[PDB]
A paper describes a structure:
The CorA/Mrs2 family of pentameric proteins are cardinal for the influx of Mg2+ across cellular membranes, importing the cation to mitochondria in eukaryotes. The mitochondrial inner membrane protein Mrs2 (mitochondrial RNA-splicing protein 2) is responsible for regulating the Mg2+ concentrations of mitochondria in eukaryotes, providing controlled uptake of the ion14–16. CorA/Mrs2 forms homopentamers with two transmembrane (TM) helices (TM1 and TM2) in each monomer, which are preceded by a soluble N-terminal domain (NTD) that regulates the Mg2+ passage. The protein family exposes only the loop between TM1 and TM2 to the surrounding environment but this stretch harbors a conserved selective filter GMN motif that is essential for permeation.
Consequently, to further illuminate the Mg2+ conductance mechanism, we prepared a new CtMrs2 sample using a mild isolation strategy with the inclusion of EDTA from cell lysis and until final usage. Two cryo-EM maps, with and without applied C5 symmetry, were determined at an overall resolution of 3.2 and 3.5 Å, respectively. The EDTA-induced structure preserves the homopentamer form. Indeed, the TM domain including the pore is well maintained overall and the intermembrane space remains negatively charged, presumably facilitating Mg2+ uptake. However, as partly achieved by rotation of these side chains away from the center (discussed below), the constriction rings of the pore marked by D420, M417–R413 and R406 in the closed structure display a striking enlargement of about 1, 5 and 13 Å. As a consequence, site S at the GMN motif is the narrowest point of the pore (4.0–4.7 Å in diameter) in the open structure. Thus, we conclude that this structure represents a conducting conformation, allowing the influx of partially hydrated Mg2+ to the matrix. Remarkably, among the most displaced structural features are the stalk and α5 helices of adjacent monomers, which are well separated in the open Mrs2 setting, thus eliminating the M1–M4 sites. However, while the conserved R314 has a peripheral orientation in the closed configuration, it serves as a wedge in between two adjacent stalk helices in the open conformation, through interaction with the invariant D410 and N414 of the neighboring monomer, thus directly influencing the matrix-facing end of the conducting pathway. Furthermore, toward the funnel tip, residues R200 and R203 of the conserved RDLR motif of the α1–α3 subdomain interact with E346, D348, E374 and E378 of the stalk helix of the adjacent monomer (side chain interactions except for E346), residues that assist in establishing the M1 and M2 sites in the closed structure. Interestingly, while we expected a Mg2+-depleted structure, we observed cryo-EM density at the S, P1 and P2 sites, which we tentatively assigned as Mg2+ despite the EDTA treatment of the sample (the P2 site is not as distinct as the other sites in the map calculated without imposed symmetry).
Author numbering:
A (entry chain C), B (entry chain D), C (entry chain E), D (entry chain A), E (entry chain B): 162 to 263, 271 to 483
């Protein structure tokens, strides 16, 4: 059900005064008042794709956290029913009030305020995302551990998500900039006085949009650079781990060779430890002779094992 | 062969009474009665893609479990020969009878009933799919086992399948909503009275379709979130298993070092266990001296092995 | 070279009698007799893509094993030079003779015979492919072996190939069905009598083609289901093998712990086996005391090793 | 720099005599003499894509090793400056001279010679590529070795490269065949006499091009079959290697069990080898009793280890 | 903010004298002076895609390191605010001054200078990239090490990046060459005198652009060849490492067999080392008999182990 969702709205009139505070307005009343279309509101209500639409009496903006309807006399900010106003929305409202209470027309000032708020939020989000990755990379320079690699991958996923979001916002602004008739139709005050700019006269809007398109492009480039650096660090860590595993295997082989070398001498001592006739008992040289022979044979076995271990891994 | 498949049909007249109960009607008789086309029925008979088609005297619906033909006076629900009516179909029939026996026209009420049944079935299927995954993830928080990972992957496949099905249904409704002439052609009662709405007057149908498009979109988003969480859990489990394997290898190396350390002292005891002249027999200090020397050499070998094991894996 | 390939041909006249038996006809003579075009024959001669083409005096069919030219009076089946007639071709010829010697026109009966032969061959090939996979899956339920997995993959490749072939045949029939003017141009007997059906009158051909399109679709669906089941079985087998490898590694570690535990007691016995003064000789309690001490120390070492092995793999 | 590259050229007049031998001609002189365009010569000079272009007074061919300009009276073969004539180019020149010195027009004979040379070179290259792979596969049937697998992969890369080259040549001929106005414009002798063939009269060119398109298609199919066979052999070899590794691991485990079984009996003998009171000295049955007990315990330990090894890997 | 960025500019007049040295000019002043459009300057200011644009009174070039505006009387080189002139830019300025102070028009000479500078920079960058890879590949011919493989991959990434950059530059020149009306519009001096070349008269520009397109294509081909060689070397190194690992495993197995072979003889010596009645004491043959028996049994165990090791890995 729920045919009418009773959206939450706030409005500002021509002089910048708060003509209406946070209230509940139906969709039908909003459509009747602003003369909109259901398709435009349905496009706005999607919270995945930003949109900047122009209509012969309105400008519709659905950016990251702003749902704004700008007319030549009124500005409306709306949201879903039951939602509470956040700090960025209050800051945007205060900035819009300050700019409107103070040459540029009304709609251009509103658009400037919206773009300034969006760029500030983008920069703050980028810094908040970027700082822990720098801290982790600083900590990883001393020792290499698998948990740190897992944390690095977890942070890299968030960096990629933010890069995608910033790229989407920049592409929306670029697609608005590429159109020519929309920039001509963005003049509302001259439209009220029956003046048409034409398709060859749009100077202020192009500069105003470019001045923030550049700011978005810088953030996108920086995010891409951070992603590349993270990937390189991960590759280096993996190579180091593989080398460590190979060294451990070689050490185990050397320990096995040593064990065999001791076992041979233990066997020889056991042979002369029997309860039989050795024929060299009660002689002074027997003990030293057998000890030297056993030690020499153990050393020879160890040397042969080490030599063949060196010869095998020569390739 | 089988030129005529003799489809099973049920019909409801204008007053909502059951004018005909479950029966067998040929394809040719159905085409002659309803004035359809073979291509539309062939498109409907496919059980892989949902379809909402409009014709100048009919509305054709092939959703998840409904094959419905809506006219301005009659409603027909049909299925393949030999099939038995299920509980959702009986519930839909009862709901349609209750809504029609009771302002909105006939076809809009039928469409509302169909959409309500489809959304209810989608929500029930989503809950039934979602519950075992939550139970498995709750059980996996204590211990990690490979069989639980296999069960998690098996359930994730079903979640992905349901997400694809819900996405297909939502895309069908969205594609119907985007068209403009179809919404104008959806008025049948006014068409009987020779009244044409035009391409600029369609208000009721747009709201009615949006009110269920939103409900489908919510389910699609929730399924995507569940899939992402499952993937993250699988990655964490794999990392834990790799760390466990490395720890086991290190323990094996330490055991080898201990074995060598004991073997050296065993060799020394075997050297002094021979049946020869030791020159220190019948002396009080010999036993303690040899015992201390063997223990000291074993400890030295163990310490050197542990030190080199620590030094190797420093990188 | 080889400008003229001298294709092998067989022909049947209007009354169904064999007017000509297996013979050698040049390409130029065939083109002059049937009034064809080089492009159509070049399209037919490709043995990778099936084709159903319609021309104002002919129907051209290049299916799996049939190269058929159907006219309003004659039917020709042709093949490459030097080829021998197989059993399916002879069966198709006998069936066509029986159907033509016996309301439906000539070309529709020929098309029915061709489609029946193709569907029968498809079903026979599917059964022959499907049976060994079922046998292998039945044998694999008792024990898991790598050779059986290799055989399963080898059979799965053939199942995928047959699925692709059946999908290609079904897509050809569907693409023929979607066209509208071709179905109007498929009437040759009425074309001889200067009667044109038009673009709104084609009933018999649509039903006739749908009745075999459904039969192809069923086989495609069954092949896809078999492929999915094979993939699931392969995944289960791989998981079982990995678990077996981990269990073997754990058993090896336990054997190493046991070896160390015995080695410690062997060292202690070797210490008291020396030819020196033990100070407890000729006493009754010495043997039992040393035996108990060595056994106790071996058990303590084994218990400590097992406890640390349990503690390491807790994660 | 190098505005004019001074291409190397050879020419043949209408009677087939060598009117000019290998010489250096500028690009501007060639363009002025033949009335060409810079774009066509730039397309020809690329050595990666074959091209068959038709112009109202010329035919331009850039195949594998031929850069040929055919007119109704002259034939020119050109190449880069400083290059030397190879054996295939000399053979093509001799064949062209023999065919022209001898019904078919001039340009069709030149095209026939070019296509014959290209097909002969393709077949020779295919045989030269194919032979070593067959030799390696014959040698690999006795024993499996990693170096042979590396050689097989190295040869498979070359087979894939040749398959791609042959596919490119066949696609060029097919794209020339599909065009209709080009085949009409390929008649130059009739164009000199002011006779136009039209878009419905082209018989000789189609057969002439098809007779070599088939020859290219055969080679492409054979190369694809060889690639598939190589891939299957590689998969079989990898499976065999994995089975060998598993068998080696099992053998190592059995050796460890045997070592433990001997160690237990060595410990028991060491216990009775001490210099204490055994209480069974100077008795006849003691030696046999202890020997039998130690052997029995060693056999019991070995049997238990083998039984648990069998029980672990049952899954 | 920053509506006007105050770009850094340098200018050269018709006679080639430096009419203005490095200065700061606003975007609005540049647009008013040169009669440009905001879209063209926005396209130029992107530093990722090279561009060669033609306008009825200007030529706009944004290559690797040059931002050049060429008119029929003036040449301007510009860059961002705060940047310092580099050595390639100074060399390009000196070369342009030397060429202009000295038949070809003004704009063609400027374009020749720009293309010469770009090709020289491309060749220098290619040589600087190529040399360390050759040095590393020369050093790797003696011994194989993982660090050298890591360095090889690191250098291969840079080679791929340079190949992509050169491919982008070559594609820009090719796309400029393919256009026909742009080459006609590239004549500015004739445009001042009201002479139009037409779409069929452009000879000088085509040759001038081709003479550098070839130079770019050569560098792209050489970079691709280097990348392929690097990949082949990496594959060979990986195969060698795998063979080394297998050889190490076989050596470990042989060491285990030797350890067991010695352990058996040690057990037999321990059996005859006990303090019981051997019944062969005070006999001459006992010592030699037991020594020979123990050595023979150890050799038999070693031989059996080696034989079964050979038999296992036969497949
Ligand atoms: C007659 C001349 C013939 C040629 C001379 C011999 C040339 C090669 C040998 C030197 C023998 C010294 C011991 C080196 C054995 C190497 C294997 C081994 O296990 O030794 C150590 C650890 O064990 C250890 O730290 C010591 C383990 C016990 C050593 C084996 C028994 C030594 C013989 C009996 C000594 C009482 C393994 O680590 P590495 O330091 O890398 O060994 C290689 C360099 N020592
Ligand atoms: C003269 C001063 C020289 C420096 C002092 C030595 C410094 C380093 C050594 C301490 C020796 C104590 C035993 C530690 C050996 C480590 C290898 C080992 O196998 O021990 C244990 C298990 O075996 C065990 O639990 C015990 C196995 C038997 C121990 C080897 C023989 C000990 C010598 C003979 C004792 C009668 C392996 O697990 P971990 O607890 O992690 O070992 C490291 C910490 N102990
Ligand atoms: C004083 C109280 C201290 C705490 C009590 C000890 C608590 C823990 C120990 C029980 C010791 C019994 C032997 C278990 C050793 C485990 C390692 C081992 O190699 O034993 C077997 C195979 O070897 C075998 O089947 C036997 C190998 C030889 C056993 C080692 C020497 C035993 C001591 C000398 C006995 C004459 C390994 O397989 P598992 O059955 O899984 O072993 C774990 C359960 N037994
Ligand atoms: C009282 C009745 C209790 C049940 C009877 C025992 C049933 C199971 C045992 C038979 C024992 C014979 C030796 C088989 C041990 C298996 C492990 C082993 O290392 O033996 C061989 C190689 O070593 C070898 O070739 C020989 C290595 C030395 C053998 C271990 C010591 C034998 C005891 C002392 C003999 C003087 C391993 O390879 P396999 O042939 O596959 O072993 C399994 C079949 N023999
Ligand atoms: C009665 C006739 C029966 C048939 C004759 C026997 C046929 C097969 C055997 C020859 C035995 C000689 C020793 C070869 C054992 C092979 C395993 C081994 O560990 O030896 C070496 C290293 O250890 C070594 O370098 C030596 C390790 C100690 C050798 C084991 C004990 C030898 C017996 C006691 C000798 C006093 C392993 O490396 P490889 O050279 O590749 O061994 C294979 C070729 N020797
Ligand atoms: Mg050991
Ligand atoms: Mg011992
Ligand atoms: Mg003794």
């Amino acid at each position: 059900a729920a045919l009418d969702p009773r959206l939450r709205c706030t409005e500002v009139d021509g002089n910048g005064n708060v003509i209406m505070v946070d209230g509940e307005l139906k969709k039908s009343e909003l459509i009747a008042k602003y003369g909109l279309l259901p398709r435009d509101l349905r496009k706005i209500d999607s919270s995945n794709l930003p949109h900047i639409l122009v209509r012969p009496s309105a400008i519709l903006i659905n950016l990251l956290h702003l749902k704004v309807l700008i007319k030549h006399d009124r500005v409306l900010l709306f949201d879903v029913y039951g939602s509470t106003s956040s700090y960025p929305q209050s800051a945007f409202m205060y900035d819009l009030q300050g700019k409107l209470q103070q040459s540029l027309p009304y709609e251009f000032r509103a658009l400037e305020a919206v773009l300034m708020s969006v760029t500030a939020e983008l920069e703050a989000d980028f810094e908040a995302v970027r700082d822990p990755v720098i801290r982790i990379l600083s900590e990883l320079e001393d020792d290499i551990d698998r948990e740190k690699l897992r944390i690095l991958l977890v942070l890299s996923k968030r960096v990629s998500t933010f890069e995608q979001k910033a790229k989407l916002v920049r592409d929306a602004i670029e697609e608005l900039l590429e159109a020519d008739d929309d920039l001509a139709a963005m003049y509302l005050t001259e439209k009220t006085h029956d003046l048409y700019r034409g398709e060859d006269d749009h100077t202020e809007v192009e500069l105003l949009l470019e001045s923030y398109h550049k700011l978005c492009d810088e953030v996108v480039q920086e995010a891409s650079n951070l992603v590349s650096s993270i990937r390189n660090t991960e590759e280096i860590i993996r190579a180091i781990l593989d080398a460590n595993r190979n060294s451990l295997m070689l050490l185990d082989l050397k320990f096995s060779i040593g064990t065999l070398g001791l076992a041979m001498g233990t066997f020889l001592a056991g042979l002369y430890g029997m309860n039989l006739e050795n024929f060299i008992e009660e002689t002074n040289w027997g003990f030293g002779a057998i000890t030297g022979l056993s030690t020499l044979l153990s050393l020879v076995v160890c040397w042969y094992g080490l030599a063949k271990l060196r010869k095998v891994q020569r390739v």
